[PDB]
Design a protein around this ligand. Structure first.
Ligand SMILES: [Cl-]
Ligand SMILES: [Cl-]
Ligand SMILES: [Zn+2]
Ligand SMILES: [Zn+2]
Ligand SMILES: [Zn+2]
Lengths: 48, 8, 48, 8
């Protein structure tokens, strides 16, 4: 199963998401991340 | 939201 | 004193700051805001 | 950072 990533509409960094989730909102921000260690725009983007 | 997919 | 605002480097919204801040980081984000009600990019920008 | 001032 592929790794899904979502782009923060503010900082444009890509954040990994767990497999479970379609049904994302139209706009998405780091602050919405289920992973609490990647939940603001200051955290660097994880390497691919 | 804008998404992408990469192979594991 | 006048009202200081700082711009989020990610979302480009302006945020009011209190008087007498220590020196700000080169890159400043909503997450860094001392006002806890304005600490992410999803909060709309306050009217001028 | 980038900053501005407005009158109170
Ligand atoms: Cl942020
Ligand atoms: Cl955010
Ligand atoms: Zn972000
Ligand atoms: Zn912001
Ligand atoms: Zn943010």
């Amino acid at each position: 199963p592929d790794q899904t990533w979502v782009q923060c509409d503010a900082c444009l960094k890509w954040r990994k998401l767990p497999d479970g989730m379609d049904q994302l909102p139209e706009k998405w921000y780091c602050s919405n991340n289920p992973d609490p260690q990647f939940r603001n725009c200051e955290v660097p983007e994880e390497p691919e | 939201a804008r998404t992408k997919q990469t192979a594991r």
